[PDB]
Amino acid sequence: WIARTFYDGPEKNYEKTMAILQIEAEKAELRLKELEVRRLMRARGDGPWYQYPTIDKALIDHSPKTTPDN
Amino acid sequence: PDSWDKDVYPEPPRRTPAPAPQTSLPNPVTYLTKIFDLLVDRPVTLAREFIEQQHAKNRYYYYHREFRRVPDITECEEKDILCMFEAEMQWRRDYKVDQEIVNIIQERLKACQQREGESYRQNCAKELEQFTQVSKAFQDRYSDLGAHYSARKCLAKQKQRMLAERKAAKEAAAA
Numbered sequence A: 001w002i003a004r005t006f007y008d009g010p011e012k013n014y015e016k017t018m019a020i021l022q023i024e025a026e027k028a029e030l031r032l033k034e035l036e037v038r039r040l041m042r043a044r045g046d047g048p049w050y051q052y053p054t055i056d057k058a059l060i061d062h063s064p065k066t067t068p069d070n
Numbered sequence B: 001p002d003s004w005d006k007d008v009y010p011e012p013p014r015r016t017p018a019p020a021p022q023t024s025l026p027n028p029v030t031y032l033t034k035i036f037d038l039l040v041d042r043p044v045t046l047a048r049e050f051i052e053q054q055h056a057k058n059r060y061y062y063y064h065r066e067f068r069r070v071p072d073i074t075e076c077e078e079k080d081i082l083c084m085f086e087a088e089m090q091w092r093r094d095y096k097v098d099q100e101i102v103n104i105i106q107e108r109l110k111a112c113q114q115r116e117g118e119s120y121r122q123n124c125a126k127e128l129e130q131f132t133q134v135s136k137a138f139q140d141r142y143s144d145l146g147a148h149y150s151a152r153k154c155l156a157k158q159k160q161r162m163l164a165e166r167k168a169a170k171e172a173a174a175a
């Protein structure tokens, strides 16, 4: 009666633990991958992150400058 | 009594002597047993019959749980957590069953020692040997794993034992 009224079968806890383990293992893998990706982008600078600004090329004046040799 | 299996818990045929009264003096033990029976066993027996018929009026069943086999830790990938979880649970259940097997053998040994009286050092040699074998197996399987034991540590211990055995056998073969 106690088991019927208050508790649940072993399979429920078993499968819930499987799901929790899957979720947290995926999270750990994603954390390692994030660290590696951050290191690579900061070292190289070829990704969307760590893009430090440079001078805009639309600021340059392309017109004769009173002197042929600029 | 069918309440337990006689093959798992063996008991000798229980041969007992017969009374051979050499004197006409009536003993107190037989009269005491007779009055004990009449005054104690009969009321207990009638109460048990009443309770047993009450139980027979309402008969219901309960079942033993069966567990399927799953891949063990030897056939689980290095970082695959789901198969590791299943193998770990299986290994823990097998560990519990092994503990109970050792318990059964120890109960056999204790019962033999009590039963044999003064000739226990001789008549319990089979039980002593069987307990020695079971103890050796259990000690090899599970000893020195630690408080944080697991299937991986048991596997590593077995692997180290097998390396030692293979090396010793190879050295003996080529000598």
Ligand SMILES: CCCCCCCCCCCCCCCCC[C@@H](O)O[C@H](CO[C@H](O)CCCCCCCCCCCCCCC)COP(=O)(O)OCC[N+](C)(C)C
Residues within 6 Å of the ligand: A003, A004, A005, A006, A007, A008, A009
């Ligand atoms: C002869 C009898 C011998 C046994 C006596 C047992 C008495 C039990 C009392 C102690 C029980 C402690 C509580 C244990 C569980 C409570 C918490 C939780 O586990 O239970 C919840 C449920 O709790 C109960 O609904 C309520 C419990 C409250 C007990 C209160 C008892 C004392 C009250 C005293 C009041 C006095 C009167 C007021 C005076 C002013 C959730 O259960 P639920 O998730 O649904 O279960 C579903 C199971 N399924 C999935 C298989 C279907």
